[PDB]
């Protein structure tokens, strides 16, 4: 039970926004431009860390 | 032209008024949704210029086809736009025109002069196959961020006086980008022409609540839990 619960929580955490425009990297890579996407990508990287 | 008699009563909603929140398929899962719903075991009005508030649950059980059409507006005058829905034996027509409505609008049967004086300036018009097809018909109307949403369901019922006990999910029917305010609404009847008649229907109101929905293996909702009815429901929602 504990192993399954921990894995489920870890995989569920991937859908959070952490104060970004979107929780999908492809959406940001298809909508925005290189020199501005970093501000959004940093929050996702941190939260997943 | 006034031929309407309305008597009010009150009854229990039980567990009616559950609809699919969105168009995403799910199966064999339990989901949690925060949206406008009709609370379980509610005080619903029975009727033999009602406010709109924040959504309306409407129910009827008459097979006479005496019920047809609806009017939605803010001031119910020709100075402001008003949704008008008409259903007849062939099609359904939706208009957003600023009609000069009357005190008791109803179908003459089929002149609409008693309904309104004349049509006026307007842009949106919709024509589709009719909504209407021992039986119970349930509808849910809401209006959020410029979109008017309608859900409907038709079920076969046995001989009963009040609403039956059970679950029947309501499926989306249409969605219109109107973007106007609605504060009051009215119901249209079709009396032959001037024989007096009577009709009954149930009305309830929606509130923002959190629900727990259960999907079966084929993707249909078969059970729901209101997360604020009583402590046992709170425990169920916490434990998922």
């Amino acid at each position: 039970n504990h192993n399954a619960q921990a894995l489920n929580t870890l995989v569920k955490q991937l859908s959070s926004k952490f104060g970004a425009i979107s929780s999908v990297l492809n959406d940001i890579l298809s909508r925005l431009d290189p020199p501005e996407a970093e501000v959004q990508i940093d929050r996702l990287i941190t939260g997943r860390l | 032209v006034n031929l309407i008699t309305r008597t009010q009563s009150y009854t229990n909603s039980f567990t009616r008024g559950v609809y699919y929140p969105d168009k995403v398929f799910r199966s064999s899962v339990l989901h949690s949704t925060q949206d406008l719903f009709l609370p379980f075991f509610s005080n619903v009005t029975w009727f033999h210029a009602l406010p709109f508030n924040d959504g309306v649950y409407f129910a009827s059980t008459e097979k006479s086809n005496i019920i047809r059409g609806w009017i939605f507006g803010t001031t119910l005058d020709s100075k402001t736009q008003s949704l008008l829905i008409v259903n007849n034996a062939t099609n359904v027509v939706i208009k957003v025109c600023e009609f000069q409505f009357c005190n008791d609008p109803f179908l003459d049967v089929e002149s609409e002069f008693r309904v309104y004086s004349s049509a006026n300036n307007c842009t949106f018009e919709y024509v589709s196959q009719p909504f209407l097809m021992k039986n119970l018909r349930e509808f849910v109307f809401k209006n959020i961020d410029g979109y008017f949403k309608i859900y409907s369901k038709h079920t076969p019922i046995n001989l009963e006086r009040d609403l039956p006990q059970g679950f029947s999910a309501l499926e989306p029917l249409v969605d219109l980008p109107i973007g106007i305010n609605i504060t009051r609404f009215q119901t249209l009847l079709a009396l032959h022409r001037w024989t007096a008649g009577a009709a009954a229907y149930y009305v309830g109101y929606l509130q923002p609540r959190t629900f727990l929905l259960k999907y079966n293996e084929n993707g249909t909702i078969t059970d729901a839990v209101d997360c604020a009815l009583d402590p046992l429901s709170e425990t169920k929602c916490t434990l998922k």
């Binding site: 859908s15 909508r31 431009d33 | 168009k23 398929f25 979109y147 980008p177 993707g219």
Partner: protein, 299 residues
């Protein structure tokens, strides 16, 4: 290290690359009425700003580039370069005429008389603003007073709010009762445009495009033609703006006639509906894993 002991070591990972790309789109053919909203020879005032809704058409931006060498072109939600491939549900178009010096006043988080009394944008705005000079169309030699601007309002306006009230603003409790003068002034002033006027005062046609994301299945996009369909192969797919990669197989799921997507316990996409031909397809991720190296000692 230059020496390795006996054992098994975990080095790097491996995965399988997609073979090709798959693009799908509906069979619509009607072109969007972007031409009509422009070059109409008639533009509304700033306080009474026109609103139009565009949907259910093929959105092509070539007319935007060939229409005029725009003086101002600022996109906020997305970059202007990647606009010919995105998909949207509804588009909102606003057009009006403003003074050349007020163009920068129209942006989210900005002030100005247009901003607070005429028209303001939400902080989370997602769209573009286009402005081109119109000195040779709406600048009479004697002057044109058709366009007016508000100057006084009790408070700040709201995002996406249109004001059409025409009342004499009262600067206090001094009664005026419809007259103009003491503590009672008309807040609307007419533009003055002449060809002799230089840059900074000549009229400018301004059009604001506003998009909305993730509200319904996409309806306005598709300038790129669709391709064929393949199965049982690692491939990229783009279903009406939904982009992904993996393997597509036949599905036995019983989709309801109004839902299109599919999800699982972990909230991931595991099914899709082909737009052109109504069919259900299961999506599975392509193979990936770790690579281990088994070695005896280098000695």
């Amino acid at each position: 290290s230059f020496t390795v002991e006996k054992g098994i070591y975990q080095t790097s990972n491996f995965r399988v690359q997609p073979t090709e790309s798959i693009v799908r789109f509906p069979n619509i053919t009607n072109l969007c009425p972007f031409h009509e909203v422009f070059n109409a020879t008639t533009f509304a005032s700033v306080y009474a700003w026109n609103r139009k809704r565009i949907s259910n058409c093929v959105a092509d931006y070539s007319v935007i580039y060939n229409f005029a060498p725009f003086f101002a072109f600022k996109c906020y939600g997305v970059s202007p370069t990647k606009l010919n491939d995105l998909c949207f549900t509804n588009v909102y178009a606003d057009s009006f005429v403003i003074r050349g010096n007020e163009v920068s006043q129209i942006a989210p988080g900005q002030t100005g008389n247009i901003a607070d009394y005429n028209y303001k944008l939400p902080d989370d705005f997602t769209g573009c603003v286009i402005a081109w000079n119109s000195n040779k169309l709406d600048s009479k030699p004697s002057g044109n007073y058709n366009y007016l601007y508000r100057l006084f309002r009790k408070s700040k306006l709201k995002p996406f709010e249109r004001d059409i009230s025409t009342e004499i603003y009262q600067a206090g409790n001094k009664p005026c009762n419809g007259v103009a003068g003491p503590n009672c002034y008309s807040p609307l002033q007419s533009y003055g445009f002449r060809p002799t006027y230089g840059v900074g005062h000549q009229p400018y046609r301004v059009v604001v495009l506003s998009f909305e994301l993730l509200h319904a299945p996409a309806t306005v996009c598709g300038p790129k033609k669709s391709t064929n369909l393949v199965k049982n192969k690692c491939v990229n797919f783009n279903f009406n703006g939904l982009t992904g990669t993996g393997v597509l197989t036949e599905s036995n799921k019983k989709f309801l006639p109004f839902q299109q997507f599919g999800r699982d316990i972990a909230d991931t996409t595991d099914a899709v509906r082909d737009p052109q031909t109504l069919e259900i397809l299961d999506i599975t991720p392509c193979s990936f894993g770790g690579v281990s190296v088994i070695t005896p000692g280098t000695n």
